[PDB]
Amino acid sequence: GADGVGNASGDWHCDSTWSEGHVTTTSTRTWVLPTYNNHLYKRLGESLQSNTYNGFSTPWGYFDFNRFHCHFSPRDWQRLINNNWGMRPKAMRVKIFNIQVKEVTTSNGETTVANNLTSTVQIFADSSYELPYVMDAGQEGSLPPFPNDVFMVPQYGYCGLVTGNTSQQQTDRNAFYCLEYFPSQMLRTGNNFEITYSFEKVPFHSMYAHSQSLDRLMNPLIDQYLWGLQSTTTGTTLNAGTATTNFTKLRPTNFSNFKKNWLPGPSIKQQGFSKTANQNYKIPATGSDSLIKYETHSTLDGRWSALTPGPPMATAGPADSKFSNSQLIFAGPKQNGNTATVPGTLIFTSEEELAATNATDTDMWGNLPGGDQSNSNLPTVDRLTALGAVPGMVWQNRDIYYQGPIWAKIPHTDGHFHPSPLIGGFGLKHPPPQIFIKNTPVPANPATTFSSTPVNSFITQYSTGQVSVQIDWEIQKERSKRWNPEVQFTSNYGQQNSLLWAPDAAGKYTEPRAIGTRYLTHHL
Amino acid sequence: GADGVGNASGDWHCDSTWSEGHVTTTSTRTWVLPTYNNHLYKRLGESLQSNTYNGFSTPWGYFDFNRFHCHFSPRDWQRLINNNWGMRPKAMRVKIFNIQVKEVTTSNGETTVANNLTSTVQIFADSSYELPYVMDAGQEGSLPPFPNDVFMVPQYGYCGLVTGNTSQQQTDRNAFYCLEYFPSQMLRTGNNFEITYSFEKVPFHSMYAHSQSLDRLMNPLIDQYLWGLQSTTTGTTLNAGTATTNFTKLRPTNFSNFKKNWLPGPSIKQQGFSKTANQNYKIPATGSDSLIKYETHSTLDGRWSALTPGPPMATAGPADSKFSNSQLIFAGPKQNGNTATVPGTLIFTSEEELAATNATDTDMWGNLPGGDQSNSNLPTVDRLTALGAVPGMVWQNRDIYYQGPIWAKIPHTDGHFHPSPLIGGFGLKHPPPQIFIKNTPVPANPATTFSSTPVNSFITQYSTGQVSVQIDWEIQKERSKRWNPEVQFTSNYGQQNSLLWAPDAAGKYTEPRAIGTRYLTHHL
Amino acid sequence: GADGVGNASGDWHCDSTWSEGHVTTTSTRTWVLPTYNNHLYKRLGESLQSNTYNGFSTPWGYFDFNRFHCHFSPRDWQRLINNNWGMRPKAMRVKIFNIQVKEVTTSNGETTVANNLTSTVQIFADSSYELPYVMDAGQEGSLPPFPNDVFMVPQYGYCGLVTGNTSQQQTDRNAFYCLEYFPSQMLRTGNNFEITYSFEKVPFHSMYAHSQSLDRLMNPLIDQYLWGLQSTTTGTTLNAGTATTNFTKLRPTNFSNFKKNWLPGPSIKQQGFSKTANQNYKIPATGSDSLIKYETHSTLDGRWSALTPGPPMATAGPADSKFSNSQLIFAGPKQNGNTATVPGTLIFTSEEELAATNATDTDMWGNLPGGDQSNSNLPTVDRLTALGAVPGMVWQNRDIYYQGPIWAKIPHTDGHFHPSPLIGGFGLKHPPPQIFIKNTPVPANPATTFSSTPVNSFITQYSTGQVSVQIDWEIQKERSKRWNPEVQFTSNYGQQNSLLWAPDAAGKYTEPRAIGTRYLTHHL
Numbered sequence A, B, C: 001g002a003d004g005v006g007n008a009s010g011d012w013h014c015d016s017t018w019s020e021g022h023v024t025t026t027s028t029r030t031w032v033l034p035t036y037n038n039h040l041y042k043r044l045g046e047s048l049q050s051n052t053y054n055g056f057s058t059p060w061g062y063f064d065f066n067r068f069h070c071h072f073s074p075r076d077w078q079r080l081i082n083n084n085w086g087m088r089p090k091a092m093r094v095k096i097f098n099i100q101v102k103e104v105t106t107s108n109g110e111t112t113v114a115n116n117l118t119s120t121v122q123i124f125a126d127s128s129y130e131l132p133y134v135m136d137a138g139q140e141g142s143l144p145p146f147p148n149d150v151f152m153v154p155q156y157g158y159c160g161l162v163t164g165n166t167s168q169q170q171t172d173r174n175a176f177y178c179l180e181y182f183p184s185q186m187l188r189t190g191n192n193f194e195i196t197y198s199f200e201k202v203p204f205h206s207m208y209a210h211s212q213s214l215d216r217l218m219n220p221l222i223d224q225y226l227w228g229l230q231s232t233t234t235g236t237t238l239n240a241g242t243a244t245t246n247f248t249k250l251r252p253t254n255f256s257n258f259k260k261n262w263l264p265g266p267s268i269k270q271q272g273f274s275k276t277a278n279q280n281y282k283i284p285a286t287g288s289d290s291l292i293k294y295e296t297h298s299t300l301d302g303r304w305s306a307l308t309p310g311p312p313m314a315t316a317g318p319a320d321s322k323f324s325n326s327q328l329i330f331a332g333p334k335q336n337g338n339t340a341t342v343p344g345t346l347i348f349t350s351e352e353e354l355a356a357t358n359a360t361d362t363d364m365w366g367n368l369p370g371g372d373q374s375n376s377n378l379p380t381v382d383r384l385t386a387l388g389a390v391p392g393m394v395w396q397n398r399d400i401y402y403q404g405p406i407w408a409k410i411p412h413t414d415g416h417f418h419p420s421p422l423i424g425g426f427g428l429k430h431p432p433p434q435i436f437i438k439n440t441p442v443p444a445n446p447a448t449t450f451s452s453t454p455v456n457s458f459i460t461q462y463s464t465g466q467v468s469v470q471i472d473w474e475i476q477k478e479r480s481k482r483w484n485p486e487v488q489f490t491s492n493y494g495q496q497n498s499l500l501w502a503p504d505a506a507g508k509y510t511e512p513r514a515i516g517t518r519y520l521t522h523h524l
């Protein structure tokens, strides 16, 4: 990739091509790149007991396309989800171009901008995965959903290890990575970048809700050939009757005692809250009794971490007054602030579909006897609040969302367990590589006599250009023998003043709701 | 198409090549492209009871060549129409080039402009016809008739469906189209665009007036062998005579009772008005009794729409004091305003030629008895005001004008009827494609710290370049055995201070009159 | 097709195979055939003034598959309609088999049935179309929607011409057709029938609702270059002002006066009624003033015929209190009788979608002046109630329904107009052929001495067997650049006691609602 100054170095492609069981999304967006940290690396750190962290902020920016709406349009996502029991990324190709480097000159009063033709910009992809991976933390920076929205490239920054739960102080293990210590490609207008990636083979995402329920997978018309204890006494009253060993053949209408082959999957109880302000308990944000303490969390090296997405568990409804972590929440259309007090201002996700295989988040997994029953003792009935893997469990994973993550890098650790990103998406060992970009520094007028001191005065600059990502998605059509019509993502937003999923009168594009994927159905 | 900065990317071609029965018009014009809607899409809507509408306005512009004077010169149009009984578009080729992108900087006092070499402009043709077609609504935006007139590219905007006749409110059917969701070609100075199209096979336009009249297509020297009822009585006085059944052989001088094989085509009565202000009735513009109400109109979903061009019908004369819809009216040479009160300030079209086959607009189709005549009853003589298609009808279509439309897209509907654009022109299923163009957004100085908010600050820009359209027209020479000379479009504007059909002393080109096409003659 | 007694002569196939743009439905059903008209042809006739009719009833039965639900399942119809802008029949193959002939013997008290192995049954297809075509009259007899529902084969009967509007008396033109005067194929158990058909090339059915509205097909941002009369006076008051000729440039916000190229299609006013019993007028069924008289109807040879389906016209809503002919009405799920008084007991269809191109059924087409306006006269504003074809009209046709007709035979007449069955469906010149079937007569014990009198005593018999129809449907996927999600047929029947579109607890299958086809959208 290399030509002249007055020659576009690439074209605008915003395809959409469906077929058999392959769909290829292609999209381009214009971007802007500032001069981060005024050209330098800055060591980050701040002791915040549990929020304690340390690291570094770099002068580099980076492209992030880890959000579904970066590739599919509303209509597409609809297509995709109303006719396919699953999908998955297969291949990706990214390309940056039409680089334009600008140098600003703030006048006596206001700023004036001009084209620095010979100025260069750098790009390079960490395809060896030797740098903290940031594109999968569910953070901002991905491309805009709306094709014609210009966006700012995010600043690259990474965290180191926090030794302790007190100080951000760093050990001899903490490491510093320098992006200049990498081979980068230098570009000027007329040059361009391009790269290709191939997704690892990964399981198709569900994209369907279950019909049958795990506890009702038998023939309602027939007896088991298995027997069990029905009751130890004769009455209808606890601890009172002639006392006997009553065994049953386990036949229809019973079912809750039918011997079964599979159990619901692992769960960890979550605290449930109400959207109606006065049904909660009045826990504060800050303080020694901050919400954190009362919400189910994990503990790493003395530090707390909300069990946020957490294990795949059946959740509350999107409409239900109850909600909780485990439920993804996105900003509403009219919500533009770091804070809100009106539930109706936000968007609530829901894993209600999982109630066919997984346990409910706020409830429990089941119950255990708290001791050994006797003729002179009925044991306490304990609560199975958290339960790990056990032979015979099966479960569904969290759904995927139109404005959700697409993939996440699996942690470089010997051993794990069922690698599905908890925020959702595809867990890859080596995922789409992070592409870094940064404007090259331009020394301003220099001293006329030598100085071993590093340069300070730099011309002020910023760049802009387009970028396009093309991902090949493998999808699988359904083919069920279900007779009755299925549920489907439909418009149904009724009459409206300014069409939904479209810019308003002021020219602002905003996403009305969150869209799932599990509309279609498959049995167990 | 791709070369250097100091290298013209195309040349100026304003041909004219006649021959056998093929004529090729080629013309180029310089254009200017602004930054529409300040870069964004805006939802349009306004409840105006009957004028109610909704839609969107885009940041894109578009080339429109759907006007005859965009291609032929006065003299050409003359050539074309004085020797050919018909013509039609055959092929088209368009090309944009010499792109120049400029960035403005308004100084403390006044503006200053400079060349942004690396800035890009986008172009693309919706050749899949997947976008509201606008080029055929008889609106402004086509190229200037005068070769050396710079023009502004029109803003693309489209309307959605209006559900109701009250509110502009939109339903789940209304759709939003985004032009960035298309593959567009990016250009810089030195790049260029080009495309080719081939007109569908379509009937040659008339270009001739009829000699014979539909009701007089027999031999004036001979009797029919058919008989008919002449009169039911004996006198010369209605309802008075000896009463008898008088049949005739239907011979010469009669003719109005001759049995004929064809009837005049469909018509719908139109209200006629006078150019002399006090011969009308004093209907107001606005109000509950707006002109609309009193003028023949159609009704779609409770909304009114003037039956404007309407069915092909014989019209008043261009000089006659009477005029009406059904008659195309263009702005006069000295008329420069959205309004006028002096008929002589405007230009009146006329379908007077159709009086040989079609019914007259303001009159009626014919008459019917309002009941069954009897010896004790003479029925009311009813007025056949509107009549649809009936086996045996034949008719001529509206003429074509030098400054008229050339083609129009036939509506995507199962079924229609005789697809001739009512404003006139060629009805194509897939017509010359709409070519969209828009300047690419250029972020102004950006923030030094990341922000997930879409960019606002953009350098101010506008572009200019040339464009040329070449259309190959198939024409058919006459070959009549008519003996007497034919009528012809002649100059005859007598003496003049500043030659007509030429710029004036001030350098302004203005079109004197409207030119038809039906000067030559063919019989029936 | 011919084998043994203990050898199935065919298998059960109830496929469903989707693909590219071709879908093949295959379905089988079990049937029963009685002995119609006790073996003989009976001349039909009954003078009922306007309901007068004559004809013949035959001893033959016939297979009818002219209903969409005979082939697609709920889910299929859903698939089909949420992803395709159209479809059409391409090829068909039918086959009858597993013939079983039974002979009944009513005992002293009750009946006893036995297998008559050697008894034969006849089948034959009128593929020369030489017999009144009955399969397209929107009558009963088609196969059951539910695969496992046994059905009775319909009796074949046809009507002759009614000369007059008084007597059922027949002329020398009336004709009698005898099915025995055809080559039929005789079968016994072990034999079978089979046949293939290929649909004529026919336009794909719409399957989409329009976005844009016919009267709003321009760019809302630009002026026309055409001028028109705005008002004849100065005030805001009719017949009062300084009186002038006010012409306008016809620019935005106006639109109802914009010169347009196309008009709404033909229409004929229909009377509208209310579902709320006391908003009507109290017209009786029978009588000299029967509803017929007051409802728009046609008149053939003095006989009346409700203009029932009638012309494609925008209709009321399915929920609207107003309804009318022009709207297809089907029996509700709980409606089991020839009569009903509760609108909510039935199912109402709706062509509300056509309001983008067609005129509204109950309203009118538009308005005309009732005379010529003058300075001393403002003409009556007439109502354009019925309007036929007129150059420039365009329109959409009636939708298709899940339980609607599929095709209809075009009448054997020189000339017609836009052959789309008015009840809906595909108008074919030569449609799927009528397959006739009838049990062969079996003489009971006969006289021992000769008699030239035709046989009377026949063993009592009836037959049963399976039949399967396979139709290859050509469908076209969409491919719009619409951005916002589309409307879609979704379940949404909320919670329920007995799942919908599925048998109830009693084992009865009933269709909840009627399903259209126009969920997807295309512009104009």
Ligand SMILES: Nc1ncnc2c1ncn2[C@H]1C[C@H](O)[C@@H](COP(=O)(O)O)O1
Pocket: A202, A203, A416, A417, A418, A419, A420, A421, A425, A426, A427, A428
């Ligand atoms: N997103 C994703 N990525 C990878 N694997 C997934 C994912 N979702 C479910 N699984 C399953 C597939 C295999 O059973 C498995 C292997 O983990 P391993 O430790 O590699 O033996 O985990």
Ligand SMILES: Nc1ncnc2c1ncn2[C@H]1C[C@H](O)[C@@H](COP(=O)(O)O)O1
Pocket: B202, B203, B416, B417, B418, B419, B420, B421, B425, B426, B427, B428
């Ligand atoms: N401008 C134009 N375009 C197309 N057809 C025209 C036009 N003017 C007249 N006609 C006639 C030619 C055929 O008779 C016809 C077909 O309409 P169809 O519905 O395609 O059968 O309409």
Ligand SMILES: Nc1ncnc2c1ncn2[C@H]1C[C@H](O)[C@@H](COP(=O)(O)O)O1
Pocket: B414, B415, C202, C203, C416, C417, C418, C419, C420, C421, C425, C426, C427, C428
């Ligand atoms: N269902 C159906 N069948 C056939 N034609 C249809 C149908 N629907 C619309 N049309 C249109 C297609 C052609 O324009 C036409 C020809 O009628 P013709 O009299 O054959 O010239 O009618």
